[PDB]
Structure 1
């Protein structure tokens, strides 16, 4: 698929940088014809077929195809796509309140209601995606952004569909591997992956929201991955003494090694607590 090849600078002005990763950089921008503001994500293209630098066109097209399908309050909206010889540039909805990761870091520890207020929105977004048979595969606090961080109950959007895949056969078997602290055991073990992997990631996020601590984090990436595969975590009393037994139950039912036994997104919404990769 071909994208707009006009110079993006003829249609947008850029400003502050919003995110910077291994293969992409995001800049705030403003559309000249409307004055509306967006986030421009510049994804570096691969320059030779056999290279490891940049992102393959297949991977870029997949991300764009998924973003084009989705529209929901708890997921980012794609506005348009440009490209040139070096980059594919995604003009995405601007989410101005920053990452949930930074909100958690800057703010004192959350209450159980503050945690569930964020969590219910994440679950609604993931319910939408899974209903579409879309696995995100990179859910974590850095990939959730707040619309306005200065309200009592911030609204959020899920971002970063760089690893997302359509799961039309129940599972996929491809080169898919997220951030060590959040990946499911099936990712660590290079097994076929489905929607269940996201549910594990939600369990990790929930643990962090309630405690400020990461359940499987080791001193090295290999330790973290070994802890995940062995389901080596526990609820530390120092951090969970004020947390309800029902919150711990919710987590326990997500941090399950066998993906078939793990709660699904629909199970998570009906749960009583809610219902109303290498070192170098």
Structure 2
């Protein structure tokens, strides 16, 4: 699929940098025709088929295709796509409030519930995000707060219940099936939600070791505990919620629908 080949600079003006990835940079921008503001994500293209630098056209198109499908208040929307020789440029909704963690159980669940609603929408569409972590939970406007899940760079449509292709995010947040290079499904997202919840409530990371290999070993082993010093005041129900997500066997882990009915919620190298 081909994208808009006119110079993006003829239609938008860029401003402050908003964030980045390995082969991407995101800048605030303003559309010349309307004055509406967006975030322009410049994704570096691969220069050759054997290159390890840049993002493959296949991967870029998958992210674009997923973003086009979704319309939900808790997920980032895609406005337009441009491209040139070096970059594909996604014109995305402006999420200007920064990362959630930068910004009590009631406060934690208020944000957690919006994450759950957004993931419920995704999973309803058989879309696994595969990269859920605090850095990808943004606040639309931290001055009003509504969250927006961002960065669909690892996201996949799961049409056969699982995907088998060495998908791998950030060691602290990936499920044991990712660490062990096994078939992956929506369940992996639910693990990552348990990790996010643990950190939300405690400011501590459940599996984090001193090196990447230690973190990964800890994840695979389900080597974590609710440290009394960090969780003394936290309700048993909150811990129960987390415990049912941080389960090695994906089949035994709470689903997104389970998480919404849970008594706490219900009203790599």
Query: How does the TM-score come out when normalised to structure 2?
Result: 0.99
Residue number in structure 1 paired with 2:264 = 273
* SS across alignment from 2:226: coil
Q: Deviations over 1:175-225 (max 9, x none)?
A: 310000000000000000000000000000000000000000000000000
- Structure 1 residue 267: Cα displacement: 0.2
- Structure 1 residue 174: Cα displacement: 1.2
Residue number in structure 2 paired with 1:156 = 147
Where does structure 2 lack aligned partners over 5 or more consecutive residues?
none
Q: Deviations over 1:113-157 (max 9, x none)?
A: 000000000000000000000000000110011022134xx1101
* SS across alignment from 2:16: strand
- Structure 1 residue 2: Cα displacement: 0.2
- Structure 1 residue 265: Cα displacement: 0.2
Q: Deviations over 1:45-94 (max 9, x none)?
A: 00010010000000000000000000000000100000000000000000
* SS across alignment from 1:181: helix
Report if aligned partners of 2:247, 2:253 keep a CA contact under 8 Å in 1: yes
Report if aligned partners of 2:167, 2:178 keep a CA contact under 8 Å in 1: yes
CA distance in 1, matches of 2:56, 2:136: 21
* SS across alignment from 2:172: coil
More off after superposition, 141-150 vs 198-207:
141-150
Residue number in structure 1 paired with 2:65 = 65
More off after superposition, 30-39 vs 140-149:
140-149
* SS across alignment from 2:218: helix
Structure 1: which 4+ aligned runs deviate by more than 6 Å? Answer: none
CA distance in 1, matches of 2:47, 2:187: 34
CA distance in 2, matches of 1:74, 1:20: 20
Q: Deviations over 1:6-33 (max 9, x none)?
A: 0000000000000022110000000000
Q: Deviations over 1:240-264 (max 9, x none)?
A: 0000000000000000000000000
* SS across alignment from 1:119: helix
CA distance in 2, matches of 1:268, 1:250: 8
- Structure 1 residue 96: Cα displacement: 1.1
Residue number in structure 2 paired with 1:43 = 43
Report if aligned partners of 2:101, 2:200 keep a CA contact under 8 Å in 1: no
- Structure 1 residue 101: Cα displacement: 3.3
CA distance in 2, matches of 1:21, 1:185: 24
- Structure 1 residue 172: Cα displacement: 0.3
- Structure 1 residue 100: Cα displacement: 1.2
CA distance in 2, matches of 1:102, 1:44: 27
Residue number in structure 2 paired with 1:107 = none
CA distance in 1, matches of 2:143, 2:223: 36
| Matched residue count | 269
Report if aligned partners of 2:14, 2:28 keep a CA contact under 8 Å in 1: yes
CA distance in 2, matches of 1:174, 1:60: 16
